[PDB]
């Protein structure tokens, strides 16, 4: 008997289903670590991360909400992106779009 215990049924949850995704190889060219958030507009991440910014336009990391991906200096890795939904209007970040798309 454990007070307030859960009884989660076994299985898995499929995240962001029915949405366009694309894989991109990314390399940290900076001398300091960079950690990106699940909903951060990828095309506007730290300028030290080298990758095809054009492809990541309107995309964010295809990871569970709230989590992150870290890139140590010199690190190179392939990540998967999923497209923004809603109005597909990007506001903020580095201010490169500030509108729809």
């Amino acid at each position: 008997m454990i007070p307030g215990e859960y009884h989660v049924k076994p299985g898995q949850i499929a995240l962001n289903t029915g949405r366009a995704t694309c894989r991109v190889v990314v390399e940290n060219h900076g001398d300091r670590p960079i950690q990106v958030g699940s909903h951060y507009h990828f095309a506007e991440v730290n300028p030290a991360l080298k990758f095809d910014r054009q492809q990541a336009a309107g995309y964010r990391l295809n990871i569970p909400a709230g989590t992150a991906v870290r890139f140590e200096p010199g690190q190179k890795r392939e990540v998967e992106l999923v497209a923004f939904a809603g109005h597909r209007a990007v506001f903020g970040f580095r201010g490169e779009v500030m509108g729809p798309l």
Partner: peptide, 10 residues
């Protein structure tokens, strides 16, 4: 802190 949008110089 994460240097997500850029480093301190940015």
């Amino acid at each position: 802190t994460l240097n997500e949008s850029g480093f301190v110089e940015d």
